[PDB]
């Protein structure tokens, strides 16, 4: 859900309290999905935000 907040201009919990990008960003953003590797059958609880 919070992938479009990575782009500059947008606002949100992640975009303003954890990671903010400048309005003159001249780079690239790479995103992919990995559910089985990052989570076991019981779920992952070592991630903080």
């Amino acid at each position: 859900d919070e992938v479009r907040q990575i782009a500059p201009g947008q606002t949100g919990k992640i975009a303003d309290y954890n990671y903010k990008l400048p309005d003159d960003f001249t780079g690239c953003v790479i995103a992919w999905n990995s559910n089985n590797l990052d989570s076991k059958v019981g779920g992952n609880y070592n991630y903080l935000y």
Partner: antibody, heavy 120, light 110 residues
């Protein structure tokens, strides 16, 4: 200039097999992306398939999942498309699509295509 | 279930600036690149817009495009409205390992 020649249709068959081939020239075959696109006569465009520059990864739409297969070779610069268990919906005009960097930049390439009709 | 919604018959006007709107519903179309394609009825299609802001070599600069994120829609604008051949246009995006195409927007009377 890039020339794309397609000649794989011109006959009808219910639920059999048909092979389509697209011939390409004027560019390196083993460095870019290619795809396949079809459209119904009088209807809009829709996507069929895509293939990597070495044929390792191939993908399809859920409507043609289970059937369909695509193969390639860089020696003679050609594309192969095999269809099996065709239906009446498959009356479409097929263009061999060629990409530039990936599935994000765009298609930008469309051959003249071949008229394909199916009758039972 | 990503799709794109666009009208079927717009821009029926002589010689001024009009806009064509392409929007999606399942996800945000601003995450990935969206392009505009045109086809000549009875022959091969071409492309007017790639990379959501750029044009092919030889394509006139009359065409213009923009993206709005408030309504999550893609806007294609044509300025000259010349004697260009009748055609219909499509809207293409990319969700995950698949391609989605628009319904089509006929434009015959210029």
């Amino acid at each position: 200039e890039v020339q794309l020649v397609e000649s794989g249709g011109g006959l009808v068959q219910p639920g059999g097999s048909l092979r389509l081939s697209c011939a390409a020239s004027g560019f390196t075959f083993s460095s870019y992306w290619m795809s396949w696109v079809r459209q119904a006569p009088g209807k809009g465009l829709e996507w069929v398939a895509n293939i990597k520059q070495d044929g390792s990864e191939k993908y399809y739409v859920d409507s043609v999942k289970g059937r369909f297969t695509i193969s390639r070779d860089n020696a003679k610069n050609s594309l192969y498309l095999q269809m099996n268990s065709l239906r009446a919906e498959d009356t479409a005009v097929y263009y061999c699509a060629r990409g530039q960097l990936g599935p994000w930049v765009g298609v930008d390439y469309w051959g003249q295509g071949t008229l394909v009709t199916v009758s039972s | 279930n990503f799709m794109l919604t666009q009208p079927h018959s717009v821009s029926e006007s002589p010689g001024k600036t009009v806009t064509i709107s392409c929007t999606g519903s399942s996800g945000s179309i601003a995450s990935n690149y969206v392009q505009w394609y045109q086809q000549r009825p009875g022959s091969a299609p071409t492309t007017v817009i790639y990379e959501d802001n750029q044009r092919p070599s030889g394509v006139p600069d009359r065409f213009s495009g923009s993206i709005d994120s408030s309504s999550n829609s893609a806007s294609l604008t044509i300025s000259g409205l010349k004697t260009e051949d009748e055609a219909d246009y499509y809207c293409q995006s990319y969700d995950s390992s698949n391609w989605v195409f628009g319904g089509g927007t006929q434009l015959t009377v210029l």
